[PDB]
Paper text:
During LPS biosynthesis, a membrane-associated glycosyltransferase (LpxB) forms a tetra-acylated disaccharide that is further acylated to form the membrane anchor moiety of LPS. LpxB is a glycosyltransferase in the Raetz (lipid A synthesis) pathway that catalyzes nucleophilic attack of the 6′-hydroxyl of lipid X (1) on the anomeric carbon of UDP-diacyl-glucosamine (UDP-DAG) (2) to form β(1–6)-tetraacyl-disaccharide 1-phosphate (lipid A disaccharide) (3). Here we present the first crystal structures of a soluble variant of E. coli LpxB in the apo form and bound to UDP, which reveals a novel glycosyltransferase-B (GT-B) dimer wherein the C-terminal tail of one subunit completes the fold of the other subunit. The structure reveals that LpxB has a glycosyltransferase-B family fold but with a highly intertwined, C-terminally swapped dimer comprising four domains.
In order to crystallize LpxB, a soluble form of the enzyme was generated. We identified, and mutated to Ser, six Val and Leu residues (V66, V68, L69, L72, L75, and L76) in a nearby region of the LpxB homology model. LpxB6S was used for initial crystallization screening and optimization. LpxB6S was crystallized with one molecule in the asymmetric unit. However, the biological assembly is a highly intertwined, C-terminally swapped homodimer. These results demonstrate that LpxB6S remains catalytically competent and suggest that this solubilized form of the enzyme fails to extract lipid substrates from detergent micelles. In contrast, the knockout was not obtained when the gene for LpxB6S, LpxB6S-R201A, or LpxBR201A was substituted on the plasmid.
Author numbering:
A (entry chain A), B (entry chain A): 4 to 61, 72 to 382
């Protein structure tokens, strides 16, 4: 008898947009359907009962809300719960609801969140289905036997196959006869700081071939804009460019080429049909450490020397005081666990104690003669 | 007739120490040997002629020096050139000297520097032999058929197998009857900022079991010390700890357990025979991006969707204005190269344009009934 009842949780504007589009498409098939949960203004406009505002999630408060929703959705027993992105909140909640027999969907591949294999297994345990924008995301979950549906990317629905370059130039005031370069130094402060100078210097070089080159710089917010302008004042104060408040899509559609920091903004540039070069840089040390972890599952030299988890490594979300304290207590006891580790440390010390100066000296002598 | 002539380049204090030890061990076999190159104060004390000071390398100036050394070592034709660490300077120089028939050794595995396969091939082309401190470093180069000699770690020569815990406590003023915890929040500012609060909170938890726990915090320099104290004032102003200027080795030898940010300081802790827990955290986004690069060789979504280098990606040292400009010029020309990329962009756009809202709506309906 009860009409279709769908629970939804969005945690940011992008999720509110997805949720609103989902509600509209569902109402086309089930006009009497009921929607409830954590809703932004767009979802509420389509009729979603807002037990909580999406703004609240966009933390002690977040934990209490998830606890309340766990109980309330448990009583409601919705036909489906859809966690819209926000994986740090929704994956756990989906697991809580799954435990109670409720059917769950996670919308949007949680790529950043799923940083190791254990997190993949957790998504599979928490969900009945994952909705992925891109085909290689589904191919990934297929390898883990995690039900995943490739649904296409919403931005590809929103952007036409053949954008109007001259129309975008008219919006931005770019002459139609000129070559035009888009510089997108990045949405994150780290990206802007690393790459702004190099991108400006690139534009200076291009001006030597294209002295009338138009340079458009979409800047996502005031902070990043203030950051870019400060760098520019130091690096290329006399380079004339169009600083834009947002309008990245217009800038890309308008331009003849784009220089991008972000391999993810590259998608929108692709949909804009703007040829692009991706230039990105991260701290070499940070990259080396990540690569070592990906390739060996360890970060510490003792475990690499031992070929096993000799010392406890608590990384990312596990680097947390309660877990750290629990790992240290057995060692502070200065008991037999410490003596066993002590003994292994001694054997490994012997394995790399070989009078290195003398070995290097002999390598030199062997090579010289 | 000419006595053994060895060219050396060190670029930091640690390299000067290695160079001095190498010179001493060589003089034991060849007392008349001659040493020349880029030398720190320790190498000079052992007799190394300092064409340039190591301080100069510790950049236009660096480029000129490498050019001068390339010519001068080319005229000198030393029996062996040894690049001591400093790979961003020495690998290229070793390649320059190799081109002239000079025998070259690189001392110390350039793990951070060798961030991709192409850089491994470059080390092999630049060197006749690599000297590696650790066995797994040699196993790595073995896979690439790059001559590498495992020589042991110098720190393992410098530190005894059985350190004196009570002696280290006497230096630091730690009571012998007390449990003692070492907190090493990290030598880098990023590490200190991420982990100091969590490590302090861990110590607070441990105090509830060990109310007399001694807490020693080796801080590598004033900046990092000022950074830690500022964090402490906000997180645990009433937690009493021993702030140390350096003295990490003493703190580890003295302690019953150590909480470490650095998987590399973990080696020194191992040699100190101090049981340890490694707690480390890096930006999830940064880790995700690195992992994607390691696993796919790409960072941008267009190349992941295309399964090839459809768009040019210039990363790390290649993200450089001249290369960026050269990659963009063919695209700004708005010629047939741009039209070919445009056409591929259109096909990929079609492949992910599938009315996602409607697909999500149908997935919900399929699951609900």
């Amino acid at each position: 008898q009860r009409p279709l009842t769908i629970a939804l949780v969005a945690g940011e504007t992008s999720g509110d947009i997805l949720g609103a589009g989902l509600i509209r498409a569902l109402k086309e098939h089930v006009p009497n359907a009921r929607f409830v949960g954590v809703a932004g203004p767009r979802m509420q406009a389509e009729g979603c009962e807002a037990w909580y505002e999406m703004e609240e999630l966009a933390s002690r408060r977040s934990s209490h809300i998830r606890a309340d929703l766990t109980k309330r959705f448990g009583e409601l027993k919705p036909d489906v719960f859809v966690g819209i992105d926000a994986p740090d909140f929704n994956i756990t909640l989906e697991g809580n609801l799954k435990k109670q027999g409720i059917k769950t969907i996670h919308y949007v591949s949680p790529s950043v969140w799923a940083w190791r294999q254990k997190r993949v297994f957790k998504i599979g345990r928490a969900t009945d289905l994952v909705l992925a924008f891109l085909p290689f995301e589904k191919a990934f979950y297929d390898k883990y036997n995690v039900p995943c549906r490739f649904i296409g990317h919403t931005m590809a629905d929103a952007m036409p196959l053949d954008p109007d370059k001259n129309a975008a130039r008219d919006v931005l005031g770019i002459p139609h006869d000129a070559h035009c370069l888009a510089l997108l130094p990045g949405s994150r402060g780290a990206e802007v700081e690393m790459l702004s100078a190099d991108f400006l210097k690139t534009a200076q070089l291009l001006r030597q071939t294209y002295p009338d080159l138009e340079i458009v710089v979409p800047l996502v917010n005031a902070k990043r804009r203030e950051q870019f302008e400060r760098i520019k004042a130091e690096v290329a104060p006399d380079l004339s460019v169009h600083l834009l408040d947002g309008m990245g899509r217009e800038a890309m559609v308008a331009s003849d080429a784009a220089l991008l920091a972000s391999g993810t903004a590259a998608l929108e540039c692709m949909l804009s049909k703007c040829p692009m070069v991706v230039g990105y840089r991260m701290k070499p040390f940070t990259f080396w450490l990540a690569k070592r972890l990906v390739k060996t599952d360890y970060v510490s030299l003792p475990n690499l020397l031992a070929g096993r988890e000799l010392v406890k490594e608590l990384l990312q979300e596990e680097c947390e005081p309660q877990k750290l304290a629990a790992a240290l207590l057995p060692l502070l006891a200065n008991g037999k666990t410490s003596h066993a580790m002590h003994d292994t440390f001694r054997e490994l010390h012997q394995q790399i104690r070989c009078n290195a100066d003398e070995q290097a000296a002999q390598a030199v002598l062997e090579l010289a003669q």
